[PDB]
Structure 1
Amino acid sequence: KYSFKCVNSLKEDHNQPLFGVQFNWHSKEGDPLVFATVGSNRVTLYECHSQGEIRLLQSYVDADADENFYTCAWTYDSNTSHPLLAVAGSRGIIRIINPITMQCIKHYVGHGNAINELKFHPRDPNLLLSVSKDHALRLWNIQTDTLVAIFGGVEGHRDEVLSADYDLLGEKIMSCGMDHSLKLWRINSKRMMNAIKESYDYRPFISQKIHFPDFSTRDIHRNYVDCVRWLGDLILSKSCENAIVCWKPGKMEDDIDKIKPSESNVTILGRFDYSQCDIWYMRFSMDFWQKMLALGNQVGKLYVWDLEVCTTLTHHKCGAAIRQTSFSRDSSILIAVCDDASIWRWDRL
């Protein structure tokens, strides 16, 4: 159904892998389409214009030449509507950047190691989720500069957490990582709702230590799980086994909100099969309305599936691993970022 044309490409002069890309979905209709890229010690902003034009806006260069940004995520200031960009990577430092000036507003130290992904709560712009090499997830309230909770410990992940996602209403998180597991952490529990409210009321702040998840499975994939997203009440997750698996906790007819923490079953609903994406750390993405699913492979091919029912986007110059993709909010534009620092723009026909 969906068709795209490659209208432009460029290469960042640092020539290092680009691991993250995100359009700013908070921009109002009528405002310019903006996306950020992250790789090496760099954070770069670009604006999309007519006739495939990619306009460089500003570049953030970390004073630490050894920093390697892995992820970025957009939010806004709850009081002034001002756009904000969070970035993190190998150093395990979260930096809140002002995207209009490209200067860092503040930074958070805490994670014992590298941060693999950042996500903002879909309803509360102040709630930032970080997943780390230290086997834990952390929830921060960036308005009061407090660590709300740490998800890890006794029954937490046993190796690096690679990805996590909030569901559409921000009531729960699914995380995944190097231990091959996918774990559910409910944040609409009376305990978590109160811990969030308390973070707004803030002796130093006492963070919740959540050692036990609400569901756990190691029965979906047989290797590192590097990307997870909610698709309604269902889950989309992938490993390096050349498939995105669509699955759900419990038996076929089990309600996600009735799943007990000891639930032993999983139900597979289907698989999105592809090829040459058998290396670790390759993200898939969806558009805002979750009508499209995109994933790049290790040789520069871009797969796009229609979620309401597969298109393969290739260019002879795009041969490097596509680490992540991002759709514009209206889904008219798809950007792919690569291991060789190249950026590819695909416009919907």
Structure 2
Amino acid sequence: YSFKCVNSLKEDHNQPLFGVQFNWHSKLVFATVGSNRVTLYECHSQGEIRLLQSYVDADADENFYTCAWTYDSNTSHPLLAVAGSRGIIRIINPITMQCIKHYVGHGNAINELKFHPRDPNLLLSVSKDHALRLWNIQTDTLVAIFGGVEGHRDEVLSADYDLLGEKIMSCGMDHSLKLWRINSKRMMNAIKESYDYNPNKTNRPFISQKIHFPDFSTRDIHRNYVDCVRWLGDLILSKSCENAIVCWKPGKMEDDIDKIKPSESNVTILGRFDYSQCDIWYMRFSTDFWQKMLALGNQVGKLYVWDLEVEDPHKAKCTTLTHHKCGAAIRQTSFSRDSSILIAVCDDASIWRWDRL
């Protein structure tokens, strides 16, 4: 893999850009999130990054941390979910940048958003208040709260759906990774009820599931805050601030993920990808659409890209990408849907565009 840096820019607010996401759900357009805004850009030839339009929150004290794309099931158009410090989810029409609707949990910071891989209405949020929440954005219902008796004991920083959206792995400041299965009879039934719920046709409130018990948990992977997690098939990729992505699985080497029980005491390490100078927290890796490649920025503007197309996780091939003018911490990266462009965004509000050759 070989990429050439073709352009860069800086947003006027001079605050960190915490998040970036290409739109894969219909569109080449990407969103950046930082300060109290979200900004859309469109990629063109000769490295042009064309500024479109922003959403700016009415609260000058809001700080957006993340965003996530989906489809509107009512209008067929792409939609953008944004959230951050105020713990309010904004659903933004990316055409007009109008805020169409919002969701409030208990109102504590939201660290991550993810949409279900098969159902564009099912939005997962992870919070500074120790809980995950699953929302149905067609019927505007809180489907479930994941938290409580054996949930996270400190801020949740990240989470990810598996390929099918049957299960979620979450991770946090408590150093733990926790599995929550959503293909239980209980959860499939609760999703089905969320779709049957119309507040205009009934007297009841929608009753949320309180899921107090994860289906697997470990603290044996990292020795500090776990700030980013991803499924790679049935394996997990996760990181802390100890300059490593660990590739691992619940149970022993030969255990199937779907036969893992909540009492499982074992994990298996399949590999570890080391790098340098990335010991501040909330530094997120990303993969391309096909999960052939894995990209992470460090705190001094260096990019690491791993080629995952090898027989075993430990055989991954690393390429590094540097620019003499790119020296601020890279918080997140995103690949275009066709894998031809890589964007990195930075603590100094700078955006970096890398085109594949």
Give the TM-score taking structure 1 as reference length: 0.98
Mapped to 2, the partners of 1:193 and 1:177 lie a distance apart of 26
SS in 2 for 1:199: helix
CA distance in 2, matches of 1:121, 1:111: 22
The alpha-carbon deviation at position 177 of structure 1 amounts to 0.2
- The whole-number CA distance in structure 1 between the counterparts of 2:74 and 2:255 is 40
* Conserved 8 A contact 1:87-1:96: yes
1:110-147 deviations in whole A, cap 9, x for unaligned? Answer: 13410000000000000000000000000000000000
Q: Deviations over 1:174-228 (max 9, x none)?
A: 0000000000000111110000000001121100000000000000000000000
1:76 offset after TM fit, Å? Answer: 0.5
CA distance in 1, matches of 2:106, 2:285: 25
TM-score, normalized by length of structure 2? 0.96
1:163·1:226 contact (CA, 8 Å) conserved in 2? yes
Residues 304, 312 of structure 1: 8 Å contact kept: yes
User: Which ranges of structure 1 fall in alignment gaps of 5 or more residues?
Assistant: none
C-alpha distance in 1, partners of 2:162/2:41?
A: 28
Q: Deviations over 1:11-69 (max 9, x none)?
A: 000000000000000125xxxx1000001101000000111110011111111000000
Match of 1:168 in 2: 163
* 1:79 to partner: Cα distance: 3.7
SS at structure 1 position matched to 2:257: coil
8 Å Cα contact 1:41/1:66 also seen in 2: yes
Q: Superposition pairs for residues 16-31 of structure 1, below 5 Å?
A: 16-27=15-26
Q: In the aligned structure 2, how far is the partner of 1:27 from the partner of 1:51? A: 23
How many residue pairs get aligned? The number is: 344
CA contact (8 A) 1:20 1:71 kept: yes
Q: Is the 8 A contact 1:229 1:237 kept in 2?
A: yes
Contact 1:111 1:132 in 2 (8 A): no
In 1, distance between residues paired with 2:60 and 2:263?
46
Identity between Structure 1 and Structure 2 (%): 100
Q: CA–CA distance in 1 between the matches of 2:115 and 2:207?
A: 21
Whole-angstrom distance in 2 between the partners of 1:340 and 1:112: 28
State the Cα deviation string for residues 148-178 of structure 1 (Å, max 9, x = none).
Answer: 0000000000000000000011110000000
**Residue segments in structure 2 that go unaligned for 5+ positions in a row:** 198-203, 311-317
* Cα deviation, residue 244, structure 1: 0.2
Q: Deviation above 6 Å: which 4+ runs of structure 1?
A: none
Provide the C-alpha distance between the structure 2 equivalents of 1:80 and 1:103, rounded to a whole number of angstroms.
14
User: For 1:112 and 1:180, how far apart are their aligned partners in 2?
Assistant: 24
- 1:125 paired with 2:124, answer no
**Partner SS state of residue 257, structure 1:** helix
Secondary structure (helix, strand or coil) at the match of 1:85 reads strand
3-state secondary structure, aligned to 2:175: coil
Give the deviation of 1:78 after TM superposition.
1.9
Residues 243-268 of structure 1 show CA distances to partners (whole Å, capped at 9, x for unaligned) of 00000000000000000111000000
How far apart, in 2, do the equivalents of 1:323 and 1:6 lie? 17
Offset from partner CA, 1:300-339 (integer Å, 9 cap, x none)? 0000010013111101111000000000011100000000
Instruction: Tell me if structure 1 keeps the 8 A contact 2:122–2:136.
Output: yes
Q: 2:40–2:54: 8 Å Cα contact kept in structure 1? A: yes
